[PDB]
């Protein structure tokens, strides 16, 4: 069922008219992430009982897969293998002549169409004007998150009818969340739950799926106090800290000794300009050699250049903590970059008993 979705359904039903009637060649529907584009159109197609083929662009990452899946599903509605778009057109013309497919409109629903512009140059224009080429009462629908402005080819093509799905509001979200109430408690209880949850999280999280997931996760802790023995104040006081702890994470859901010194030296080399290096290390007044010199200066003990330190360097490179810049074949002048957050390096320096802030030129 659909809630707070009555204008778009009525518009689509008026557009379709009767089965023997014709319609637009191309309709482009765009909206936000949680607008329910997939739900509404699929429920409408199931209700009207129309011959429709549902296709995911991501699943059909190759042209042959797309055409073969379309043809196979259409045949099942009524093995076939095709390779070129012209062959697909010819086979579609051959297959559409069924009695069940004689005086009825054929619908090809495509979702996640954002990748279609990266598949082939002429595939999208061909799909746009399918009804002219086939001349067989065919309609093609588009679902996407990007506006039509960026789907326009350079040469220009047959403009589809553009449609927008309205964004949700507080009342609509509350109604949708309160529809699927658990049967073991009163509807007003779940309504109050949804109300407090929205009052806490609506500022950031407007995603229906995410908010519903959060409600499902946190309901068991909501229902504990009454089990333990309609007390709004009692429930709110018992439940507030848990809600704050949950809001701490909305969207989120021990190195070796010398490795720490290597990491801190790499951070210093990356974020400190070379001109000041001696100013921080020379007792009197990035390339690999600079790193080695800085490491030798920092460590109070004399470290021998054993191969194990080079193995540590390569292991750190593999662990995606240090990024290699130069060519892989050039292993005599290699370049490196450090990608560690500053809080992490401060924590590791604290565990090492080292004060990195005293050496950071930018902070000084």
């Amino acid at each position: 069922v659909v809630l707070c979705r009555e204008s778009q359904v009525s518009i689509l039903q008026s557009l379709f008219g009767e089965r023997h009637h014709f319609s637009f060649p191309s309709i482009f529907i765009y909206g936000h992430t949680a607008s329910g584009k997939t739900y509404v159109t699929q429920t409408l197609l199931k209700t009207l009982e129309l011959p429709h083929v549902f296709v995911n662009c991501v699943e059909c990452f190759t042209l042959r897969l797309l055409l073969e899946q379309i043809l196979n599903k259409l045949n099942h509605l009524s093995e076939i293998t095709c390779e070129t778009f012209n062959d697909f057109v010819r086979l579609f013309k051959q297959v559409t002549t069924a009695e069940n497919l004689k005086d009825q409109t054929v619908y090809i629903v495509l979702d996640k169409a954002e990748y279609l512009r990266d598949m082939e140059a002429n595939l999208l224009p061909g799909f746009l004007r399918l009804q002219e080429l086939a001349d067989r009462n065919v309609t093609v629908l588009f679902l996407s998150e990007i506006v039509w402005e960026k789907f326009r080819p350079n040469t220009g093509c047959f403009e589809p009818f553009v449609l927008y799905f309205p964004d949700y509001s507080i009342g609509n979200l509350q109604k949708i969340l309160s529809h699927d109430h658990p049967p073991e408690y009163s509807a007003d209880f779940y309504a109050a739950y949804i109300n407090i949850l929205l009052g806490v999280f609506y500022t950031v999280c407007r995603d229906l799926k995410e908010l519903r997931h959060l409600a499902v996760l946190n309901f068991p802790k909501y229902c504990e106090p009454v089990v333990k023995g309609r007390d709004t104040r009692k429930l709110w006081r018992n439940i507030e800290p848990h809600l704050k702890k949950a809001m701490q994470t909305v969207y989120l859901r021990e190195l070796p000794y010398y490795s720490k010194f290597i990491l801190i030296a790499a951070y210093l080399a990356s974020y400190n300009p070379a001109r000041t290096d001696k100013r921080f290390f020379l007792k009197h007044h990035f390339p690999l050699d600079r790193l080695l010199a800085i490491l030798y200066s920092i460590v109070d003990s004399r470290v021998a250049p054993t191969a194990n330190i080079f193995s540590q360097i390569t292991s750190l490179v593999t662990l995606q903590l240090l990024t290699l810049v130069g060519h892989d074949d050039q292993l005599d002048g290699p370049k490196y970059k450090c990608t560690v957050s500053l809080d992490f390096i401060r924590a590791i320096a604290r565990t090492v008993n080292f004060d990195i802030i005293k050496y950071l030129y930018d902070f000084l």
Binding site: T314, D329, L331, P334
Partner: protein, 273 residues
């Protein structure tokens, strides 16, 4: 650099100590064979050309078993060539392979199925420019992970330890030996590529020789613009039409001869010669 061919007449110095050094090195062969045969791979590092010691070890101890020698210092060697050689002789297979990884899979499966096959590897100068690829060393380590393959390698480059990672270190299972032989790197520097002008200009027409001489003279004086060069060539009567001058310029270009990419000192020496 042709003089190099005549430079081999210099006698060595202090050869007695080198003789005792080689005699001392010769005694480790049995221990090296024992360590290989138990599943360890050995790297030789040290100053001096160690090719002679490896050849002595081969001709002394490896004349009774299957063994493959790859002298990686040759700049034309690639890992695919080694794989093709192994497939064509060790397994006597001629069928081509769709990819390197498929060839590795076939070799691994064949050696795992046939436990009666033992192979020895003798690699010279593992630090070669063509063997420094990460996939190259990964392939070699995957090959050496088998218990039916024995690996002796040599290091002559300073930054060698950066080649091996922790996983690669585990796969290779290295043991090290210091063997400094002080031998000159004659053969290993021979194949490496670190006169032509005179030979080219000998059989060219004298007008082209004079034009090239004038171009060299102007270049040594201080690139020429086309108009000034054409006017000067007119003044010497070596050119009758700009089409002919452009034809001579294209002839010079075809031999990779406006700036001349030739050193000034070489031009000065060539002018008087």
């Amino acid at each position: 650099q042709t003089l190099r061919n005549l430079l081999s007449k210099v006698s060595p110095s202090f050869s007695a100590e080198l003789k005792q050094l080689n005699q001392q090195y010769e005694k480790l062969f049995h221990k090296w064979m024992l360590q290989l045969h138990l599943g360890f791979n050995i790297v030789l590092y040290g100053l001096g050309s160690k090719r002679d010691l490896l050849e002595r070890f081969r001709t002394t101890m490896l004349q009774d078993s299957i063994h493959v020698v790859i002298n990686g210092f040759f700049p034309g060697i690639s890992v695919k060539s080694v794989l093709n050689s192994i497939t064509e002789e060790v397994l006597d297979h001629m069928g081509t392979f769709r990819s390197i990884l498929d060839q590795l899979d076939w070799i691994v499966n064949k050696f795992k199925e046939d436990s009666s096959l033992e192979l020895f590897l003798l690699i010279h100068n593992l630090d070669s420019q063509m063997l420094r690829g990460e996939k190259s060393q990964q392939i070699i380590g995957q090959l050496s992970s088998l218990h039916n393959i024995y690996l002796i390698a040599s290091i002559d480059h300073l930054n060698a330890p950066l080649m091996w990672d922790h996983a690669k270190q585990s796969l290779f299972n290295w043991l090290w030996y210091e063997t400094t032989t002080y031998s000159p790197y004659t053969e290993e520097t021979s194949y490496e590529n670190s006169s032509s002008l005179t030979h080219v200009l000998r059989s060219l027409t004298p007008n082209a020789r004079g034009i090239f001489r004038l171009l060299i003279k102007y270049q040594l004086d201080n690139g020429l613009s086309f108009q000034d060069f054409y006017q000067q060539c007119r003044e010497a009567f070596l050119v009758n039409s700009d089409l002919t001058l452009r034809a001579q310029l294209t002839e010079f270009r075809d031999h990779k001869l406006l700036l001349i990419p030739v050193d000034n000192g070489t031009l000065t020496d060539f002018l008087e010669k």
